[PDB]
Design a protein around this ligand. Structure first.
Ligand SMILES: Nc1ncnc2c1ncn2[C@@H]1O[C@H](COP(=O)(O)OP(=O)(O)O)[C@@H](O)[C@H]1O
Ligand SMILES: [Mg+2]
Ligand SMILES: [Mg+2]
Lengths: 186, 52, 48, 532
């Protein structure tokens, strides 16, 4: 057993196809694991808010549903295209889901959505915030620290929810192009 | 990057300060019209130039 | 039963239909019809 | 041997795959052709529902992976952009052309010969259409425009409603007519603001003899109806004055802070006083208006509308004779506003439309403008009505610009098929088959029309071809060129007297675009798909 200076030379040349086919899937798996582990492990009478009640019965005045994400769905939802809150749960979850549904009406610029925990048990036996592809809020097990007003106040105290709408008939816009508007001549 | 091409095509000499902006540094042209391509977009054409 | 935890107890057609979430787009069209009838005249929502 | 990190298809495999993709795209929209066509209901997998018959909308909404299918979808989009009608017909014709061309290629006919034959057939078809099948609209009058609009609105949600919608479309198009230099009557469609609102029925949609804004007054203080309006169009926000980045306020003597703060809003106060001193009644601005300026307008007894869309403001200024003013700066370095920049209208009202309000600028002087308020049963119906209305407006614009129309109902297609299958024998030895296949593929339109009505396509198309052959053979039977298809009774019918017309530009552009797309797809006999 000698000749440790193998100089494998054109050996790997004949296997670049299979090696790269395996490497593409390996890179995809590594990216998925990194995105999954981006949140996890990393950190895994004025005082009574008199305005809470008024916000409560002014929030109900609109009802659609939050998008249910498919392992690559989480990857390609944030990879492309703003503040985004993502909910992790497996079927207190219903209460905060209703809170997110209520908040989505007042925040059209946000992309409220939910995703199963199974598709993505150390974090399961007993709210993720993204913006522009980078993590902003990583509040896990929020029950330790509800209503839609409470969630809104909690997110605003951290300076994450955007700060603050007339209702049209139904809609006006049709398209956007060289409309060739009227140009009165002579 | 298009400054050299524009100056060669028309004859306009670029001006970087209003002090030197004089009439002799202008490129005379016969017509400068922006046309539409049957709703596929808009193009500005400068067709016909003195000393092309 | 409101998903936010509230309770809506009524017999108005529009109030009942507005709280129902459906998947078949024909049902969505019917619910939009109910909403249109409620917004236009404000009565006859079950009849339409 | 190649060692290319990807998949490769070559020969009959890739050609058959491309024809497969084109045929699938054609079959997607084949069921939405002709008056006996039916709409489609698209769901955007988040609950959003779209109901439409327009081919371009369907192809844009669908998710497409195959490159040839993408080519056909972009072809439909281009046809919609350049003409506005016949979006399904061009896709169907292109797919049928590709299918027949591949059938020829599989018989060891070289694709270059097929492409040359297709080019010759397209040129000859355009020439024959222009020479024979066109009908001048000068001697027809408004009836021709009404019939063209009605034919365009067939197969749409406003089909039976055509008797009224055609009149509305013709009036709206004629209201915006203008003549530019060279004395060419130009009709600027898309300047007609189409507003939608559910509620009342289709029959009682409103055509506005003016302009309609999807906006309301900024505050409840101002009146919601002004008779002798003096519209002042502005392109700037009327808010408290704030210095730009290069200006910074530094105070050393404390006694001047109050003066600074007072001037900070007195500047805007003076601007509003200058604007209102000339007699302005309605003020429209693209920028925002804060509370103090709204109070000024309320006290002046005027109207203030904020966040007006730029295109809407430009149209209002053009119609009423007003001029957009991004600033009140004149050539003397001063800050003045003159009455010459005021636009006038006969009435400005905030009308109520189904629990919501919108502003109607009725009867603007110095220029006529139009807007359409579509009333329907729900959002989907109103959106489909808007799409159909846009198609009708485009058709009317094409008819009014180019004064040539052709009979509908597949009469043009049958005449072209007969003439081309007769002409193919005149010249060529191998492209003759290509021209014959072009002629045969041109018959896919009447075939689809007959199929959609559950009528015997074979007998109807045979009778149509016999009529057109008699027209092309007997000199005294040239009046049979207008024999189209009557889908209500499933019998051939003279469409020229029946009032079924299409612009010639629609057929010509559809033929050219379909031929070019078929040629583009036909040139491929090898595909390399690299792994991502
Ligand atoms: N009343 C009618 N009788 C017979 N044929 C008609 C009638 N109206 C329209 N057609 C034909 O039906 C064909 C399909 O039109 P359609 O598909 O609705 O337009 P588009 O292709 O723009 O969607 C047209 O080519 C036209 O010639
Ligand atoms: Mg009742
Ligand atoms: Mg059409």
């Amino acid at each position: 057993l000698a000749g440790e200076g193998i100089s494998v030379n054109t050996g790997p040349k004949g296997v670049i196809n299979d090696w790269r086919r395996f490497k593409q899937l390996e890179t995809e798996q590594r990216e998925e694991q990194c995105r999954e582990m981006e949140r996890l492990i990393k950190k895994l009478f004025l005082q009574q808010y008199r305005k809470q009640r008024m916000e409560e019965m002014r929030q109900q005045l609109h009802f659609k549903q939050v998008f249910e994400i498919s392992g690559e769905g989480f990857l390609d939802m944030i990879d492309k295209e703003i503040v985004i809150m993502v909910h992790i749960y497996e079927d207190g979850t219903e209460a905060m889901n209703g809170c997110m549904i209520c908040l989505a009406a007042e925040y059209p610029a946000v992309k409220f959505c939910k995703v199963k925990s199974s598709v993505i048990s150390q974090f399961t036996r007993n709210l993720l915030i993204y913006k522009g592809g980078e993590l902003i809020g990583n509040f896990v097990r929020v029950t330790d620290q509800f209503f839609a007003v409470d969630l809104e106040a909690f997110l605003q105290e951290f300076g994450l929810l955007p700060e603050k709408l007339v209702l049209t008939s139904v809609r006006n816009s049709a398209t956007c192009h060289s409309e060739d508007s009227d140009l009165e001549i002579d | 990057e298009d400054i050299e091409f524009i100056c060669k095509t028309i004859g306009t000499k670029p001006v970087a300060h209003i002090d030197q902006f004089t009439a002799d540094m202008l490129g005379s042209a016969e017509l400068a019209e922006e046309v539409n391509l049957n709703g596929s977009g808009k193009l500005l054409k400068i067709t016909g130039c003195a000393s092309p | 039963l409101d998903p936010m935890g509230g309770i809506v107890m009524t017999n108005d057609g529009n109030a009942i239909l507005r709280e129902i979430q459906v998947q078949h787009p024909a049902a969505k069209s019917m619910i939009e019809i109910s909403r249109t009838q409620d917004e236009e005249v404000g009565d006859g929502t079950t009849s339409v | 041997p190649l060692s290319v990190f990807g998949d490769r298809s070559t020969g009959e495999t890739i050609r058959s795959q491309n024809v497969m993709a084109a045929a699938s795209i054609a079959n997607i929209v084949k069921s939405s052709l002709g008056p006996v066509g039916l709409d489609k209901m698209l769901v955007d997998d988040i609950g959003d529902v779209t109901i439409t018959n327009d081919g371009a909308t369907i192809l844009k909404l669908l998710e497409v992976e195959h490159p040839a299918a993408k080519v056909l979808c972009e072809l439909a989009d281009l046809q919609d952009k350049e003409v506005g009608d016949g979006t399904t017909s061009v896709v169907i014709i292109a797919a049928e052309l590709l299918k027949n061309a591949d059938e020829l290629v599989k018989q060891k006919i070289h694709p270059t010969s097929v492409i040359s034959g297709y080019r010759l057939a397209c040129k000859e078809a355009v020439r024959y259409i222009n020479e024979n099948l066109i009908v001048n609209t000068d001697e027809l009058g408004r009836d021709c425009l009404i019939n063209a609009a009605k034919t365009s609105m067939s197969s749409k949600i406003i089909g039976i409603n055509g008797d009224f919608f055609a009149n509305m479309v013709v009036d709206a198009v004629l209201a915006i007519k203008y003549t530019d230099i060279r004395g060419q009557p130009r009709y600027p469609v898309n300047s007609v603001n189409i507003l939608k609102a559910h509620g009342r029925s289709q029959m009682e949609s409103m055509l506005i003899s003016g302009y309609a804004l999807n906006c309301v007054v900024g505050s409840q203080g101002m009146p919601k109806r002004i008779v002798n309006a003096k519209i002042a169009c502005l392109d700037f926000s009327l808010q408290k004055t704030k210095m730009k980045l290069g200006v910074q306020v530094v105070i050393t003597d404390p006694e001047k802070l109050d003066q600074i703060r007072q001037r900070e809003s007195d500047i805007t106060k003076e601007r509003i006083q200058k604007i209102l001193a000339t007699g302005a009644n309605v003020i429209l601005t693209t920028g925002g208006i804060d509370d103090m300026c709204l109070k000024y307008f309320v006290e002046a007894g005027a109207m203030a509308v904020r966040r007006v869309l730029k295109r809407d403001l430009k149209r209002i200024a053009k119609a009423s004779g007003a001029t957009i003013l991004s600033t009140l700066a004149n050539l003397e370095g001063e800050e003045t506003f003159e009455a010459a920049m005021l636009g006038q209208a006969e009435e400005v009202v905030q009308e109520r439309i189904c629990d919501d309000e919108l502003i109607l600028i009725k009867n603007t002087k110095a220029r006529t403008s139009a807007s359409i308020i579509l009333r329907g049963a729900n959002d989907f119906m109103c959106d489909e009505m808007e799409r159909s209305l846009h198609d009708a407006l485009c058709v009317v614009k094409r008819v009014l610009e180019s004064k040539s129309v052709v009979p509908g109902g597949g009469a043009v297609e049958a005449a072209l098929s007969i003439y081309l299958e007769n002409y193919a024998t005149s010249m060529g030895s191998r492209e003759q088959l290509a021209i014959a296949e072009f002629a045969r593929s041109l018959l896919v339109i009447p075939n689809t029309l007959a199929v959609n009505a559950a009528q015997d396509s074979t007998d109807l198309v045979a009778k149509l071809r016999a009529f057109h052959n008699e027209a092309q053979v007997n000199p005294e039977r040239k009046n049979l060129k207008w024999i189209g298809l009557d889908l209500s009774n499933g019998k051939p019918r003279d469409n020229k007297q029946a009032g079924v017309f299409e612009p010639t530009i629609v057929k010509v552009k559809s033929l050219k675009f379909a031929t070019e797309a078929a040629i583009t797809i036909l040139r491929i006999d090898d595909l390399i798909k690299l792994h991502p």
